[PDB]
Amino acid sequence: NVAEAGEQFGQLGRELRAQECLPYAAWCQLAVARCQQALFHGPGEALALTEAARLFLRQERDARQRLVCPAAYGEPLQAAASALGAAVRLHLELGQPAAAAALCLELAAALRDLGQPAAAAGHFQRAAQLQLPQLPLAALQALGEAASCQLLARDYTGALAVFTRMQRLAREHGSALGAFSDVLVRCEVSRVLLLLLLQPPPAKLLPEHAQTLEKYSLPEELFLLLQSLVMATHEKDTEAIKSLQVEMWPLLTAEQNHLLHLVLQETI
Amino acid sequence: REVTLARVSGTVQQLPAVHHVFQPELPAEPAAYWSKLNDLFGDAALYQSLPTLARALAQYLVVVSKLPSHLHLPPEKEKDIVKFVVATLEALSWHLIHEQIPLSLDLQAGLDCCCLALQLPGLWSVVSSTEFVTHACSLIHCVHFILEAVAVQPGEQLLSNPKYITAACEMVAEMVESLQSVLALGHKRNSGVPAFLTPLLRNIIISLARLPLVNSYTRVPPLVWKLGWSPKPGGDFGTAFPEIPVEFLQEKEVFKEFIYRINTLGWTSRTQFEETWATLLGVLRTQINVLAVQAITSLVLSAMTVPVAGNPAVSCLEQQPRN
Amino acid sequence: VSPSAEQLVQVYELTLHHTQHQDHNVVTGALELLQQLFRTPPPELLQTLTAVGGIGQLTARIKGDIGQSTDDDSAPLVHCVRLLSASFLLTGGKNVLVPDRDVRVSVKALALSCVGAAVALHPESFFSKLYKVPLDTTEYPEEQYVSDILNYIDHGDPQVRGATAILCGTLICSILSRSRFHVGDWMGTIRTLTGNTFSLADCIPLLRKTLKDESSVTCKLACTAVRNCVMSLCSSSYSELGLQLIIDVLTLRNSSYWLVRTELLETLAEIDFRLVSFLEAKAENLHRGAHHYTGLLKLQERVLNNVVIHLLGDEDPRVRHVAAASLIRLVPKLFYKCDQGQADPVVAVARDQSSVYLKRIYRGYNLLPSITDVTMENNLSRVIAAVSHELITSTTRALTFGCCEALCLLSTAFPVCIWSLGWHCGVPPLCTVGMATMILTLLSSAWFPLDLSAHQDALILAGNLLAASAPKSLRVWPALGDRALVPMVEQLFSHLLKVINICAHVLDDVAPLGSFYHLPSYLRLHDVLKATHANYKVTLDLQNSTEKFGGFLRSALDVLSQILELATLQDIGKCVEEILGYLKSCFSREPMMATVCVQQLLKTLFGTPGLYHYCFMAPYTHFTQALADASLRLFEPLVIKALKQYT
Amino acid sequence: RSDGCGGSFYTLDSLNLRARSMITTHPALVLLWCQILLLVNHTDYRWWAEVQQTPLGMCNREIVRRGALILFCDYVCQNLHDSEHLTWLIVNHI
């Protein structure tokens, strides 16, 4: 009775995907989820909710990326958020947090793409807290994406907090091994750039910041140039910082180039 | 203000008399103009001078939009501010050619000054005229060169009449598809651009694609140029192509790219808005009806804007307080 | 008696004589014979053709004195390249093309492949003059060489402009391999011998011109040329041009033809990126290229993040299989910056070349102390972190569906029991359980088990990643001793029994611990396996490696064995009769790895560094240390079934 | 140091020509031959100038260059009573 009706809604959803409208095939996938909530299935209801989530996010990728609509105002963003909220609650009720973390990563990558980085920071930190008991390297990559989202949205102190958390969780699990050392290199560059951008008073300067600012005041070229740039911003010598930005530009990625541009800006 | 305008006018007086368009592919070949462009212009003191005045004009053209009537720019220094924008952006592209990155704080100052000189109505009326077409073309090449010096690694691309008029035009069309792909904050394609350029480069590509040289070509999707569509253009410029016929808009992806270009480009003098209104009524198998309805909503909201009303660059939608 | 050399020389002169017989089929037949006889040559014929006199020591359209293959002071391949070039694809007066009216296109294609293989055997024949005796200076003013073969890059259709690509690639590879990278001395001797003006550089953009071509056939053939050529270019004195060819191959990863992408990913699989990293360290104006790019040129994180792992999500399964094989061929060759082993890329090239030329528990796990390379663990950890990142953050079906295959082939290639500090991320913190929780949450879904060629790879890879914790953990399921590892294994164990349960109800035509009646996902598994078993029971094709019910049941018994290593008698003693029933019903389909499972179930019922260190100092200390040391009971019907199946 | 007996032996300069043809394709054997030619007191500045390049690039040859220099320094590390190779190796190789 209910399963044949769910197969009928699945055929309707596939016909509507062939017709390629997609606010209304997702309504059929929500109907499939409701039908498999009528009996007790588990992960299939989660599959129907996530397929509905894919369809609403594809509707807004058609309504804000391929067509930058001035009339677009986020109507299936909210339905995709409610559907993935129901799916994450279902995975936390059944007991598998890796799938719920994957859905939070997908929702936050979608909100990073649509031009809203704080809620991406958001669900990325949520997924990175959902992956710390089981998969810490995936948690470090989720926190790295959260930190990139916060450097997009201009929340630099949150980026300090996330970067120190990443370095601490990389030292607890790297004793490095591999990509934990890449996590450590990215953190040991970008925390120094963020401690030079906002210069903290010694009250709010945590002892980890004290240890790394004692360490500087990772390959040898960029380490030498970071020591020279800390020594140049403590002395406020602008021509040296200019001749360093000319020669640290190929060595850094674009987020570190933005942070080094901001350090060179707010000292002149 | 008087010191800024006098020193900008002096640096424009040091420029050569007859301007030739900048080409970063083959610069040294056509003339000995580049001897005069390396003698008085390759000096380290003059290049030390130019982005300081670019910072000056950047903050000045910020302040212009809320000043009293005494403090606006004179109509005589207007041509000189346009030529100075062209000269500084060529200085930026020239040091990208020869030495290193320019300073990467002079990129930001040069693009500040050029975006703000493209948003003002008098300076846009001066750039969009005929006598500075070469100048406008130079801006396009230089802007793309700067984007191509930062965004696109070697072995990649952005996306996956004289000669310079038909190359800058395709160049701007490539940059509009890059606004779709490369210059969207948070996209995975945007991992290379250092994000203090993407508001500046996004605004400068939107504001350069609305020129009367380039806009008529830029609204036409490339799926139309792939098909057999080629009339003879003319408006005393090289490229003044007629409007797109509705027979190609009965395909969907052509129509999706057309509504994309007409959303991000906005409009111009009002007759081009009635042209777009006539085409989007000529569109009105059921998917195209949905997309045409959404296009009509986006037009009617593009008439709703409280400044210039049809320019996504300068302007933004009117909102009213209910408190 | 083995066949002699004079019989093969008779074959050779036979099929040189039958290139000139007037026909369409006889010419192409002799050309395909000569092409394949130059591809895989017999060794005696090849040692006679490479020699100077050659055939003389064994015996004791063409309008000029080419000179037969009997005369001395010149190798016979020089005569054969002159003969085939003058007869099939060149007019002896000028760099002018023979038309398609006179000689057909496919004859020219087979002729170009013959000249390619003949230059790959003997390069100097490419620089020979086309006529030994000069040809009628009244009618033709200048005499030309065999380099107008390379004027067939512009000729009309594909498979001629693509064959000159592989001709130029074998020309460059055979010049750099013939003379041991001393190119100036070799060109000095040839320019003193013949008067042609042709360097290797004048062939490299032409090859590059075949990569940017319209047809997928020419890009395929030019890509095989780069696979033959770029290693000999990249370590020679022309390394800048080989690096530019690596860049231009990197532009080509996204064509719409699957052979182009597989051969692209097989060119980029054989590259040693320590040497490419050295060439990036030296280069200044190559990081720019065209359009004055400022910044670096990172080939390694773009050939491994934008090409290989990017083509693990490609839609064809063939491209995903070749992408997993290319990961296996690239993990040793990486050189990520600043290890605690190799420091410079010079140290890396030195340690590879010096390490080359100066010298019963189940398959899952190890108990040795396992002396282990450090840079290899670092590169393997980088690769598994990138592969796990494109497994967890996937938004498609193809990414997981090929990424579990990439993990399973890296697991069988680089075992988790040995390289456990490369596979490690997280679990038990410090003999590792790397990343197995995500994979056990993949198998519990109702989406991933329905297609078998990734499910069986996920079973093998989950069994490896859980059995890798053997020496540390062991001191319900009493032998485990690491309690956070107790549920995961239980999951697999129940899952495997339920999977084996389905296969019993597939092989015995029965309509429906391990029980799958009330789960609404394993009934879908039964429907999929029943359809595939119907397709096997209808079609008779015995010798297939890929069958997807033989391989699936093979994997579901192998991983059940490898898990039954860890168990005890108190854990299995309530479940032995059920496993023996599901193996008595499941013996006749696959008995080779169903007696492995009975063998393991019968075990556990009865108790059971800086370029001075690497080049000289370390092999010399091992050498002198060696010279210092040198001074001194329900099994019985299944056993009867196994005996009959033996006999 | 002794020449071959009228061409009846492999003399050192022909075998050194063969080893200089081995610079590119086999570096480790060349470095072992470098320490052998250091070990017998045969320090002829022609061969060391050719193997150290004493006033893109080829890859493998570079190894030999750095290798030879380290080994040559080890020779001057041991018997340094003569001031010849100190001044030669510090003037030219800086």
Swiss-Prot record, chain A:
Is Nucleus a UniProt keyword of this protein?
Answer: yes
**A GO cellular-component term linked to this record:** nuclear body
Q: Which InterPro entries match?
A: F8A, TPR-like_helical_dom_sf
Tissues and organs where the protein is expressed, per its UniProt entry = Produced abundantly in a wide variety of cell types.
- GO biological process terms on file: negative regulation of proteasomal protein catabolic process; vesicle cytoskeletal trafficking
Q: Which UniProt keywords apply?
A: Acetylation, Cytoplasm, Endosome, Nucleus
Database matches in SUPFAM superfamilies: TPR-like
The protein's location, in the record's own words, is: Cytoplasm; Nucleus; Early endosome; Nucleus, Nuclear body
Q: What is its main location?
A: cytoplasm
Assembly, per entry: Interacts with HTT (via C-terminus). Interacts with RAB5A. Found in a complex with F8A1/F8A2/F8A3, HTT and RAB5A; mediates the recruitment of HTT by RAB5A onto early endosomes.
Q: Which disease is it linked to?
A: Up-regulated in brain tissue from patients affected by Huntington's disease (at protein level). In a Huntington's disease mouse model overexpression of F8A1/F8A2/F8A3 impairs proteasome activity leading to the accumulation of mutant HTT and causes defective mitochondrial functions.
Q: What does this protein do?
A: RAB5A effector molecule that is involved in vesicular trafficking of early endosomes. Mediates the recruitment of HTT by RAB5A onto early endosomes. The HTT-F8A1/F8A2/F8A3-RAB5A complex stimulates early endosomal interaction with actin filaments and inhibits interaction with microtubules, leading to the reduction of endosome motility.
Q: Which PANTHER family match?
A: 40-KDA HUNTINGTIN-ASSOCIATED PROTEIN (PTHR16797:SF4), FACTOR VIII-ASSOCIATED GENE 1 (PTHR16797)
- The name on file for this protein is 40-kDa huntingtin-associated protein
The organism encoding this protein is: Homo sapiens (Human)
Which gene underlies this protein? F8A1
Swiss-Prot record, chain C:
Coiled-coil intervals, chain numbering: none
Tissue specificity remark: Expressed in the brain cortex (at protein level). Widely expressed with the highest level of expression in the brain (nerve fibers, varicosities, and nerve endings). In the brain, the regions where it can be mainly found are the cerebellar cortex, the neocortex, the striatum, and the hippocampal formation.
Q: What domain of life is recorded for the organism?
A: Eukaryota
Q: Tell me where the HEAT repeats sit in this chain.
A: 198-235, 298-336
Question: Which protein family is named in the record?
Answer: Belongs to the huntingtin family.
User: What disease is recorded for this protein?
Assistant: Huntington disease: A neurodegenerative disorder characterized by involuntary movements (chorea), general motor impairment, psychiatric disorders and dementia. Onset of the disease occurs usually in the third or fourth decade of life. Onset and clinical course depend on the degree of poly-Gln repeat expansion, longer expansions resulting in earlier onset and more severe clinical manifestations. Neuropathology of Huntington disease displays a distinctive pattern with loss of neurons, especially in the caudate and putamen.
* Quaternary structure note: Interacts with PFN1. Interacts through its N-terminus with PRPF40A. Interacts with PQBP1. Interacts with SETD2. Interacts with SH3GLB1. Interacts with SYVN. Interacts with TPR; the interaction is inhibited by forms of Huntingtin with expanded polyglutamine stretch. Interacts with ZDHHC13 (via ANK repeats). Interacts with ZDHHC17 (via ANK repeats). Interacts with F8A1/F8A2/F8A3. Found in a complex with F8A1/F8A2/F8A3, HTT and RAB5A; mediates the recruitment of HTT by RAB5A.
Task: Let me see what the UniProt entry remarks about domains.
Answer: The N-terminal Gln-rich and Pro-rich domain has great conformational flexibility and is likely to exist in a fluctuating equilibrium of alpha-helical, random coil, and extended conformations.
Which protein is depicted?
Huntingtin
